[PDB]
Design a binder for this molecule. Structure first.
Ligand SMILES: Cc1cc2nc3c(=O)[nH]c(=O)nc-3n(C[C@H](O)[C@H](O)[C@H](O)COP(=O)(O)OP(=O)(O)OC[C@H]3O[C@@H](n4cnc5c(N)ncnc54)[C@H](O)[C@@H]3O)c2cc1C
Ligand SMILES: NC(=O)c1ccc[n+]([C@@H]2O[C@H](COP(=O)([O-])OP(=O)(O)OC[C@H]3O[C@@H](n4cnc5c(N)ncnc54)[C@H](OP(=O)(O)O)[C@@H]3O)[C@@H](O)[C@H]2O)c1
Ligand SMILES: Cc1cc2nc3c(=O)[nH]c(=O)nc-3n(C[C@H](O)[C@H](O)[C@H](O)COP(=O)(O)O)c2cc1C
Length: 611
């Protein structure tokens, strides 16, 4: 229960703001969009501020009309058909309230991914609900699809949004001058005890650990084990064990473990070297808006090296506003023009951004090397880069068997980018380098999920997780085996797993064989996709066992679980379940779909997919 800030409307009145942009974000994408819209206000004679709804009480929206030409914008992401954690309060409020929002003007931009049944559910709800409550829409709902290109969807919406705002309120495009949000303050003689060295919350919080641990106060768990899971050399799949003893962290199979990684030191050093900057300068970036709660873009004071290493994202392709602001620092005309045009909503500038930056997966260093005239000051770059996010992993262990250890099953990311270089996954490269052996510590925390084994030990379980999708099921199988050892009555436990070849990347091969031998796994159905000319996938095995699965589903009350790739595997497995139901019900495809979607609402078809 966070302590709410005082009314955001009064803050707007006291600081001359007429527009406030709220963000529902978990990976920081909606947060950036909000900040971008907020900063935009200035270019149209208005003044905005972005804000975390969790820190506020949206009921004060009814007071917003008290400000002339006032407006509120919501940039909301959706997660599993639900609101972001930080937007749950606001969501619950929209449902319970009956407050009259007459006079309130709003606009909504939703961040979603079409590869989901509930595409932009949050953005759609917020947009619809504010209207039901009496507020009037000032611009159409935005539907950003992260499966195509979200950045482009924002550009398009934004380009139309402002002219519509200006026309309704009768304001002009007062043109654009580079404006810093922070001021640099170099520190020449500061006590080392006050310089952030990578911690996420309070100073020295990593050195002096105190519970409870969470996203703002992660627990530095020792890496007790880090072994290679795959047999061959095509790729690198690994199994790590994080010791959470004395952390008091609670967890259950199905939960996720998040880790705060460190960027590649070489990459950090090269960025500093190409900019001719001294990365060991101790400094702070202080907000020019002395009223804002966001005093720095990241924990300060600190060195540029530490910022680029633990607080800043220096690997993902930079967004258009970043390249736009950096353009001023490119001394070669043609290069200044290419960067400037990256923010176009159409044409060659847009196409170049999509192919040369996004498709080629060029990170900031690559751009600095490919456009050699671009030499921005390090301090402004640090202000522009997005924050380094934590990465989530499906805990591969059962707390009933390993209450003081959190297991991770992950594939190391390393690929040839069309940018011509080899790109390395931040968290996995970092995880892979951690050696059991001070100790190898990993800053982490647990996030509870709704992916859970049936409450009743007798309820049948059908698990589908090819590749790394196996990771929560190792926890499930462990727990189910443990239940049998405790004398309990355990229903059928079926695993449908898949890999390329039994001698290449069959994860947990020995463990799964043991569980099967001992009866913990009623069936171990493995699809080896490359051992023959045609592909053999998990859904092929499900179709093969359609008769039995239907019996378990329709008569046994079986629970279905699907983990892994959400792009193709999940949809294909879902389609196969449609076919099974349709044939054995029997019923028309349309009803089969409803039947399966119903199982999802009744908690009997759960997902843990990602891209
Ligand atoms: C809820 C959830 C559960 C997850 N569970 C697990 C898990 O249990 N095990 C696991 O291994 N992962 C899991 N992940 C994925 C994990 O969170 C990270 O996204 C993954 O490990 C990569 O992170 P990274 O920092 O190593 O790579 P990053 O530096 O974050 O880079 C990731 C990006 O690289 C790009 N990329 C990757 N390959 C290519 C390529 N070949 N060509 C072009 N672009 C490419 C993509 O844009 C990808 O988004 C899960 C993710 C979520 C959201
Ligand atoms: O990511 P990761 O490394 O964890 O997984 P991954 O190794 O990329 O894939 C795991 C298994 O899933 C198979 N697969 C590929 N597409 C699938 C689909 N559309 N439906 C069902 N299975 C599919 C892969 O076969 P192929 O890689 O041979 O297609 C492989 O056998
Ligand atoms: C675990 C997970 C679940 C998601 N579930 C949904 C969903 O149900 N619907 C949707 O439209 N998008 C979904 N998305 C996509 C996000 O809404 C989209 O990537 C958004 O840009 C993230 O914004 P953020 O960085 O501000 O949190 C999901 C993404 C992840 C990683």
């Amino acid at each position: 229960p966070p302590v709410k800030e005082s009314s955001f409307v009064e803050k707007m009145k006291k600081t001359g703001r007429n527009i406030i942009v709220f963000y529902g974000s978990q990976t920081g994408t909606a947060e950036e969009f909000a900040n971008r819209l907020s900063k935009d206000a200035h270019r149209y004679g208005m003044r905005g501020m972005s804000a975390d709804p969790e820190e506020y009480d949206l009921a004060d929206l009814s007071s917003l009309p008290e400000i002339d030409k006032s407006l509120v914008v919501f940039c909301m992401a959706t997660y599993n058909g639900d609101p972001t954690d930080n937007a749950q309060d606001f969501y619950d409020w929209l449902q319970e309230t009956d407050v009259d929002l007459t006079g309130v003007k709003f606009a909504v931009f939703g961040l979603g991914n079409k590869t989901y049944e509930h595409f932009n559910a949050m953005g759609k709800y917020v947009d619809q609900r504010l209207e039901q409550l009496g507020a009037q829409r000032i611009f159409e709902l935005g539907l950003g699809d992260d499966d195509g290109n979200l950045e482009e969807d924002f550009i398009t919406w934004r380009e139309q949004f402002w002219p519509a705002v200006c026309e309704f309120f009768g304001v002009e495009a007062t043109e654009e001058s580079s404006i810093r949000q922070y001021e640099l303050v170099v520190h020449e003689d500061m006590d080392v005890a006050k310089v952030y060295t990578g911690e996420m919350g309070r100073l020295k919080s990593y050195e002096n650990q105190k519970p409870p641990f969470d996203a703002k106060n992660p627990f530095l768990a020792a890496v007790t084990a880090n072994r290679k899971l795959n047999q061959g050399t095509e790729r690198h799949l690994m199994h790590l064990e994080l010791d959470i003893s004395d952390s008091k962290i609670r967890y259950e199979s199905g939960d996720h473990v998040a880790v705060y990684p460190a960027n590649d030191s070489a990459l950090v050093n090269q960025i500093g070297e190409i900019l001719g900057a001294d990365l060991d300068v101790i400094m702070s970036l202080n907000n020019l808006d002395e009223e804002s709660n966001k005093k720095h873009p990241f924990p300060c004071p600190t060195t540029y090296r530490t910022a680029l290493t633990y607080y800043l994202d220096i690997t993902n392709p930079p967004r258009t506003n970043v390249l736009y602001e950096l353009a001023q620092y490119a001394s070669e005309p043609s290069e200044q023009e290419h960067l400037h045009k990256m923010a176009s909503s159409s044409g060659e500038g847009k196409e170049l951004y999509l192919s040369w930056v996004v498709e080629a997966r060029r990170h900031i260093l690559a751009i600095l090397q490919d456009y050699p005239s671009l030499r921005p000051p390090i301090d402004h770059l640090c202000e522009l880069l997005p924050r380094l996010q934590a990465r989530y992993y499906s805990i591969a262990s059962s707390s009933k068997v390993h209450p003081n250890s959190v297991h991770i099953c992950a594939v190391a990311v390393e690929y040839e980018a069309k940018s011509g270089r080899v790109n390395k996954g931040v968290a996995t490269s970092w995880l892979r380098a951690k050696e059991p052996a001070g100790r190898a510590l990993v800053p982490m925390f647990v996030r509870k999920s709704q992916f859970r084994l049936p409450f009743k030990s007798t309820t049948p379980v059908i698990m589908v997780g090819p590749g790394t999708g196996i990771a929560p099921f190792m926890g499930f199988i462990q727990e189910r085996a443990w239940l049998r050892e405790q004398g309990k009555e355990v229903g059928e436990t079926l695993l449908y797993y898949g890999c390329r070849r039994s001698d290449e990347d069959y994860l947990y091969r020995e463990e799964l064989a043991r569980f099967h031998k001992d009866g913990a796994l009623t069936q171990l159905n493995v699809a080896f996709s490359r051992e023959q000319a045609h592909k053999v996938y998990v859904q092929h095995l499900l179709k093969r066992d359609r008769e039995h699965l239907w019996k378990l589903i329709h008569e046994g009350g079986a629970h279905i679980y699907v983990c892994g790739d959400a792009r193709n595997m999940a949809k294909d497995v879902q389609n196969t379940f449609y076919d099974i139901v349709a044939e054995f019900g029997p019923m028309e495809h349309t009803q089969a779909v409803d039947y399966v979607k119903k199982l999802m609402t009744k908690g009997r078809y759960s997902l843990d997919v990602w891209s």
